[PDB]
Amino acid sequence: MEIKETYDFSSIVDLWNKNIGTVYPMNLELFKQNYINDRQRKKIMGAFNGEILIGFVIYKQWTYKSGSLKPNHKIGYINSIIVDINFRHQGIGTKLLDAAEEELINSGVKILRCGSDTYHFFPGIPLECLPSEEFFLVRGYKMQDYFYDLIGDVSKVDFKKPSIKDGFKVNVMKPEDRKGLFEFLEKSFSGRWLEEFIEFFQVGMKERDIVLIKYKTSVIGFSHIYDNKSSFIGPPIYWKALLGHNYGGLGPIGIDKTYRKQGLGRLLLYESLQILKKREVKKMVIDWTEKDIINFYGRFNFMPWKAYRKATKEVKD
Amino acid sequence: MEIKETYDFSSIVDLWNKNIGTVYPMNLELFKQNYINDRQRKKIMGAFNGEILIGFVIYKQWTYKSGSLKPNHKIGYINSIIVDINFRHQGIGTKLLDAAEEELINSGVKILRCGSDTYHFFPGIPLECLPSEEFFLVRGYKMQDYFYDLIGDVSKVDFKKPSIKDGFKVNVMKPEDRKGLFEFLEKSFSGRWLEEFIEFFQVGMKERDIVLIKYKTSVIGFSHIYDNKSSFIGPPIYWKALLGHNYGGLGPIGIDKTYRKQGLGRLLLYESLQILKKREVKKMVIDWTEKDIINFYGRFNFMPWKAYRKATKEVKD
Numbered sequence A, B: 001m002e003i004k005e006t007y008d009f010s011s012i013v014d015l016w017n018k019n020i021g022t023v024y025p026m027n028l029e030l031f032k033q034n035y036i037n038d039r040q041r042k043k044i045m046g047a048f049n050g051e052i053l054i055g056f057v058i059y060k061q062w063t064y065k066s067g068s069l070k071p072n073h074k075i076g077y078i079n080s081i082i083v084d085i086n087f088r089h090q091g092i093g094t095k096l097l098d099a100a101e102e103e104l105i106n107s108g109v110k111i112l113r114c115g116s117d118t119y120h121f122f123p124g125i126p127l128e129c130l131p132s133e134e135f136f137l138v139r140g141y142k143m144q145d146y147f148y149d150l151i152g153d154v155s156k157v158d159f160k161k162p163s164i165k166d167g168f169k170v171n172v173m174k175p176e177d178r179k180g181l182f183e184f185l186e187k188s189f190s191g192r193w194l195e196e197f198i199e200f201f202q203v204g205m206k207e208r209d210i211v212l213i214k215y216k217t218s219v220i221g222f223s224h225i226y227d228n229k230s231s232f233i234g235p236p237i238y239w240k241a242l243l244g245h246n247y248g249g250l251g252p253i254g255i256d257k258t259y260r261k262q263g264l265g266r267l268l269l270y271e272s273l274q275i276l277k278k279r280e281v282k283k284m285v286i287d288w289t290e291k292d293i294i295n296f297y298g299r300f301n302f303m304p305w306k307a308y309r310k311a312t313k314e315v316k317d
Ligand SMILES: CC(=O)SCCNC(=O)CCNC(=O)[C@H](O)C(C)(C)COP(=O)(O)OP(=O)(O)OC[C@H]1O[C@@H](n2cnc3c(N)ncnc32)[C@H](O)[C@@H]1OP(=O)(O)O
Pocket: A019, A020, A078, A079, A080, A081, A082, A083, A084, A087, A088, A089, A090, A091, A092, A093, A094, A095, A114, A115, A122, A124, A125, A126, A129, A130, A131, A132, A134, A135, A138, B295, B298
């Protein structure tokens, strides 16, 4: 067996689907979008028996800015790792992660994260990969708390408009709103979400995918919505193959801190879902939520669907 | 609003599907099979606004034997409880569970369980209903550990026959094997699984659904398998609407304690899956597993799919 670099995306995707495709169905469009467009220092290492790919790991170091946040070179990420089911418990996973980690470490990484990267596939260790938690524990990763993708079928329920205080208006974004949107993001959400807006606009997100809430003329919050016409495959619709026809999604969503706890998030969410419902969306996903916020979406009939465990390894000095 | 009994199964099922159907799709066939055939003292209480069903609870007391186990009247079960999404946080869930619990308590229940009943729908509180854990906590239920349904697509992987010691044979059950099977169950699995065999044979399970492992002529273990021809809807295939065409399942599975840790469970599992694979099964589920056994199935590419929390309320004396 040999470990070396591979960018044979269709062999990777094939191996991905054979092993975990039931619950994380991958397609080449999504795989290439997320790998190729990522701006971090990144690599894919494969394990090979001659010409046959039998495992891989994808890994990154934080070298490119996230909005106003500077890149912290101390942070590295394991985007994914899979060994084929017919070659398990032969040390191949260990060799792949040893190679990833040793490279990262030499390049200055002191904190290693399971998923959560830019252009991630997973916010953390998926519950469906719960047995890998022990694999990571053996290597010195510590298990932390959970995040959740939520699912709901917006075609099946009617909701009541929350009671509208005056001056506030919710509308899909127009091209001329971009200036104001970026000023709002620089003020209120100036890290990863600011950078997603920059990147996603570069890779095919359209104004129709963004909903803005304004007080008078000022942008005070946003949501990102997705349907089967979106040109960018974003995290809510990564697993669209499980969601049937007329799939959709929502996330992220935020309100300026000085306007919180007035029912304005609930209004923005209500209006965002009506837009989707009018676009004939049925099953849709709200991705990468914390436990404490689940009930905010659950009033609109969303339920937890997938769970991911955050996990972190501190490199010893 | 009024709380009273209801056996209007199609209104119940409708309400079930509107609220949680995305993740627990119900059909009337399964609903009626599991409610009507249950042998425990059982009731359904609904909440009504005039003629409109707006919530329900299904509950049971352990009054009928489980194989060699005597019924313990101290144990009661909440099979399910749902309030419609447009009537939440009005105390309706509280009123429904107060009525269930007060009845049970007067009838001698001291221990109340969330799911896990005979003809259950849930082994415990589903992860998709994680926010209800707080609802149950407020009422004095304590949260315990998790069980898991596992999923795999048996059409996508080839497995190698484990190495066969002599005298042991795995074959689908024949009618004349019933005597020996029952003797084995009375010896090794004389509780719930014995009773399931008795009941399931009464409600449509066929010999083709049971695989036996024998040493010489003696039955030393079994599995239950399911495909789209089974006449009984058992727990592995409760959620067959999520599993596509050519769905199937497996569980339970057991080996006589004196033959354990010899690779015989693995052989039985291997042979059971080959039978399914030859029956052209694709996605299939292994239901209600403990954490410690997941890897036994995971060698055959099964992954956790759904998670349920055990929860128990002790009635104060
Ligand atoms: C960020 C993310 O990518 S999260 C998702 C991770 N990937 C997956 O879950 C995909 C499915 N699983 C896999 O591909 C593989 O099981 C992997 C990658 C997790 C492990 O690969 P392998 O090559 O089998 O691991 P390796 O043989 O190196 O195992 C080394 C040790 O880790 C531990 N380990 C590995 N797998 C498991 C398991 N399923 N349960 C418990 N411990 C385990 C064991 O100590 C093992 O040593 P052992 O064989 O003596 O028992």
